[PDB]
């Protein structure tokens with residue numbers, strides 16, 4: 001059995017589904033039933049969390065974390081990894097057929113793992129956690145960074161890596177949880193951590209800040225005061241006042257067995273405080289989702305491009321897509337109602353799937369649409385809701401479950417059946433279950449109907 | 453990857469764990485967390501039901517039924533089948549690692565499927581349902597019988613079979629849901645159906661009946677009247693007064709590609725009204741669990757032996773293990789409190805795993821112990837509870853979840869780690885979930901502690 005999706009999906013993956021630059025109305029279909037490819041816990045109080053999912057052209061890759069005790073405890077953890085294909089069922093829609101499983105269970109607490117689809121298998125970037133995250137940021141040396149390659153021929157290889165730029169500049173670095181991407185002989189993962197303010201990187205970027213403004217809901221104050229507050233928001237005392245920074249782990253695939261990879265650090269003039277994220281490749285255009293862990297509560301998606309120069313002088317440029325639609329839940333001064341620059345470590349991972357390009361060869365598409373699963377609360381991780389969103393407003397909403405259902409991380413991927421033109425979106429959501437532990441991670445497949 | 457369990461379990465499978473014939477105390481451990489090998493539905497109202505599971509010495513086989521609509525809806529169904537191995541984790545206990553998946557999704561409503569572990573794979577016995585079960589029994593011709601072979605080399609073969617004895621004798625025949633067994637070049641599945649009263653088989657067995665009596669809770673009445681009622685209980689008007697009859701589907705494995713198999717029908721002097729069941733092979737001794745679909749509410753386990761004379765006149769002999777411990781839920785006159793012969797189609801599938809032999813070369817072990825999952829109610833499928841039971845009384849109880857949790861079918865298998873002597877029992881239970889459809893089939897693995 002080849003590691004190849006059904007042919008009707010191969011040319012409908014990682015494509016912009018709506019290329020009209022025109023206005024559209026949307027209807028989200030009912031969940032389509034199949035045997036879930038994501039295993040639940042087998043105990044009422046075991047922790048199962050942190051999904052990472054990538055649908056590649058020929059196969060998909062998936063991973064999440066399993067703890068025998070509650071989520072907050074951190075002695076031991078295990079990492080479930082699987083790869084598989086899309087297969088059409090007689091019910092009229094595809095199912096995710098698992099072809100290989102790896103359960104990393106060796107006493108190493110691999111955490112925040114991000115998965116990527118690579119030729120003949122999967123690649124996974126983790127860090128080994130031995131202490132509290134706050135202890136990581138208070139420290140002076142990053143935790144162990146691991147790169148795991150899992151192939152269809154049942155070969156599994158794992159290496160400790162020390163990417164160029166890490167040592168001397170960072171207190172800590174972890175993967176971005178959201179999936180990475182394989183693109184032009186490069187393996188690219190999202191990452192984030194704490195930069196030592198007095199280091200080389202810290203000094204160069206000391207004055208960098210980005211302050212998005214919702215013109216419909218502006219923050220009160222003079223420009224200079226708001227800018228100073230936005231700059232200070234990058235150094236939360238919760239993380240020992242390090243500069244919390246997003247970054248990209250970039251590895252040369254042709255040297256994947258020996259390279260140490262390299263950290264490509266964006267300018268903080270173009271991005272908010274470091275956080276979880278996801279790297280997408282759609283129509284050969286790279287995008288970066290950034291979790292709204294900082295004060296800005298709206299959905300963060302950037303158009304990004306890399307400049308690769310021979311000797312570790314790689315750079316990345318990012319261009320914020322101006323989105324003002326819905327807010328993510330947060331605590332205290334960092335709820336979905338706050339739009340003012342303050343020191344925030346809050347929010348929740350809720351990534352989007354863009355249905356349309358934003359920047360194209362002809363210009364900029366104001367009729368931008370994206371879809372995903374949100375949490376309908378300004379303060380609480382509750383009420384999972386499927387949505388399609390425009391730049392400024394929501395187009396359609398479809399709750400999952402009853403009001404009051406607790407839920408957390410969500411990651412969404414859409415693809416098209418080029419046989420019958422069906423548009424499918426899978427909404428992978430951490431959902432609170434009455435019988436298994438914190439979060440049955442449920443992959444909800446729906447058909448998306450698009451009209452004028 | 454070979455289709456072989458971790459070596460520390462191979463000599464601890466299908467063995468009697470307690471062979472001293474002595475009294476013992478038991479403690480059921482907490483559920484051990486792992487990624488469940490049994491997938492849930494992906495919709496809040498999709499049906500996922502009817503588990504069948506076999507752990508063989510080198511690998512396990514599993515299957516269950518998936519319907520896009522609610523369970524009572526009967527238009528379409530699909531059959532999830534998987535095979536895999538036991539792998540020890542760093543958490544100190546094994547997990548079930550799926551190695552192959554088949555999702556039979558072709559518009560044929562395969563139903564009541566029973567699985568068996570066979571060399572290099574699995575064998576599954578289904579019937580194709582096209583109408584109500586009561587319509588099956590009211591009719592005069594049995595539905596299509598299917599045998600599916602699924603091998604580790606990814607070969608899948610399916611055949612329609614017409615076992616010797618079926619045509620002309622049965623209104624209907626379906627598989628017993630509980631797993632079958634591979635034993636002495638024979639593939640043996642449980643089955644049950646409706647025998648035509650006027651047929652050869654119907655006439656030959658017209659006077660056969662079995663009336664078990666609980667010496668601690670007897671039914672009041674004269675022997676002759678109670679015997680007539682027990683005889684009458686085999687012909688429920690719910691199934692059009694056919695003789696409802698258990699049977700065994702026996703296939704020659706070396707001819708499995710061409711043989712039609714044969715029905716081996718036990719005497720109803722030794723068994724109750726036909727029902728779901730399970731065939732076990734422990735210490736090279738065959739056992740038959742029979743669901744208490746009829747008026748008798750206690751756990752039904754028989755010691756069985758076959759006589760093959762290679763002349764299509766094979767026979768089976770059964771010896772009831774007298775168990776009076778706990779009762780299964782039922783409706784109306786067929787609740788767990790009724791012990792009197794009446795026409796019943798009720799109950800629920802709850803199979804046992806015997807920890808001790810009952811009949812042995814030296815004699816009979818009155819210190820017989822078995823374990824499983826019961827439903828703690830005389831009327832309602834609710835309160836799933838793990839138990840260890842003696843012949844007359846329960847030894848230990850451990851509820852799963854909160855009081856009031858709905859649950860249905862349960863199938864239990866125990867095995868031993870011959871490295872550390874740990875005794876593991878997996879209780880596979882249909883549990884009602886708040887987020888997925890009726891019954892997340894959950895495999896709860898526990899360690900069983902046995903003392904004097």
Ligand SMILES: CC(=O)N[C@H]1[C@H](O[C@@H]2[C@H](O[C@]3(C(=O)O)C[C@H](O)[C@@H](NC(C)=O)[C@H]([C@H](O)[C@H](O)CO)O3)[C@@H](O)[C@H](O[C@H]3[C@H](O)[C@@H](O)[C@H](O)O[C@@H]3CO)O[C@@H]2CO)O[C@H](CO)[C@@H](O)[C@@H]1O
Pocket residue numbers: 050071072111112133174238275276293345346347348349381407408438
């Ligand atoms: C570890 C933990 O407490 N688990 C909670 C979980 O807590 C939430 C935050 O954790 C996660 C998240 O957003 O779910 C999970 C992930 O493992 C974290 N990564 C790492 C490397 O540690 C990730 C990370 O912390 C962020 O991306 C920031 O870099 O976050 C948890 O960090 C957060 O803790 C709060 C704390 O409650 C609060 O008292 C303090 O003031 O600020 C902290 C930082 O915000 O709390 C989150 C929930 O509000 O949440 C789930 C429920 O969704 C619990 O059941 C888990 O046990």
Ligand SMILES: CC(=O)N[C@H]1[C@H](O[C@@H]2[C@H](O[C@]3(C(=O)O)C[C@H](O)[C@@H](NC(C)=O)[C@H]([C@H](O)[C@H](O)CO)O3)[C@@H](O)[C@H](O[C@H]3[C@H](O)[C@@H](O)[C@H](O)O[C@@H]3CO)O[C@@H]2CO)O[C@H](CO)[C@@H](O)[C@@H]1O
Pocket residue numbers: 502522523524563564585626690727728745797798799800801833859860890
């Ligand atoms: C099909 C259906 O109604 N599904 C119910 C489910 O119903 C229970 C009985 O069904 C099962 C069982 O025991 O769960 C399911 C299985 O698919 C059946 N097999 C076949 C081949 O049809 C099996 C079978 O019927 C028995 O083994 C007997 O041969 O039984 C269902 O048959 C039963 O129906 C009752 C009926 O409610 C009652 O009005 C009538 O007088 O007698 C019938 C026979 O007892 O009801 C069972 C539940 O009480 O039950 C679940 C809940 O556990 C529902 O959610 C499913 O939708």
Ligand SMILES: *[C@@H]1O[C@H](CO)[C@@H](O[C@@H]2O[C@H](CO)[C@@H](O)[C@H](O)[C@H]2NC(C)=O)[C@H](O)[C@H]1NC(C)=O
Pocket residue numbers: 119120151152153155256257
């Ligand atoms: C398993 O698959 C992997 C990846 O497809 C194979 O990896 C490549 O194999 C060639 C051998 O000709 C190597 O020279 C390359 O360096 C490998 N690439 C990577 C990414 O490591 C591997 O050889 C296969 N192992 C087998 C067949 O046992």
Ligand SMILES: *[C@@H]1O[C@H](CO)[C@@H](O[C@@H]2O[C@H](CO)[C@@H](O)[C@H](O)[C@H]2NC(C)=O)[C@H](O)[C@H]1NC(C)=O
Pocket residue numbers: 270317318319320
């Ligand atoms: C790097 O990204 C930035 C966005 O942060 C790009 O700057 C924008 O360019 C467009 C079109 O040239 C202008 O309309 C915007 O006003 C610019 N924004 C800012 C803040 O300058 C920039 O062009 C990108 N650089 C490269 C080399 O591609």
Ligand SMILES: *[C@@H]1O[C@H](CO)[C@@H](O[C@@H]2O[C@H](CO)[C@@H](O)[C@H](O)[C@H]2NC(C)=O)[C@H](O)[C@H]1NC(C)=O
Pocket residue numbers: 571572603604605607708709
């Ligand atoms: C896959 O495995 C099955 C079972 O091991 C093989 O089935 C055997 O094939 C030979 C055919 O040359 C027959 O003589 C045996 O009777 C078969 N056993 C059964 C139960 O069918 C099958 O050949 C294998 N298929 C492939 C493609 O290698």
Ligand SMILES: *[C@@H]1O[C@H](CO)[C@@H](O[C@@H]2O[C@H](CO)[C@@H](O)[C@H](O)[C@H]2NC(C)=O)[C@H](O)[C@H]1NC(C)=O
Pocket residue numbers: 722769770771772
């Ligand atoms: C077949 O099973 C029956 C039980 O239904 C056996 O009958 C029992 O036999 C033992 C020893 O011969 C007696 O102590 C019991 O009293 C018998 N019970 C009944 C109800 O008759 C029978 O022996 C078995 N036959 C064979 C050949 O093993």
Ligand SMILES: *[C@@H]1O[C@H](CO)[C@@H](O)[C@H](O)[C@H]1NC(C)=O
Pocket residue numbers: 207208209267269
């Ligand atoms: C970032 O913006 C500041 C002004 O806020 C400017 O002084 C600095 O040169 C910019 N750096 C980069 C790399 O854009």
Ligand SMILES: *[C@@H]1O[C@H](CO)[C@@H](O)[C@H](O)[C@H]1NC(C)=O
Pocket residue numbers: 326376385397
């Ligand atoms: C949140 O739920 C409320 C129902 O109380 C509804 O009115 C509102 O539209 C929902 N908002 C979102 C963003 O889902």
Ligand SMILES: *[C@@H]1O[C@H](CO)[C@@H](O)[C@H](O)[C@H]1NC(C)=O
Pocket residue numbers: 659660661719721
């Ligand atoms: C079954 O028992 C009846 C008496 O109730 C007897 O006449 C008949 O011969 C017995 N048949 C068998 C096969 O045991």
Ligand SMILES: *[C@@H]1O[C@H](CO)[C@@H](O)[C@H](O)[C@H]1NC(C)=O
Pocket residue numbers: 778828837846849
């Ligand atoms: C059932 O639950 C009740 C608690 O209401 C308890 O008293 C009883 O022992 C339980 N029985 C079994 C068999 O679990």
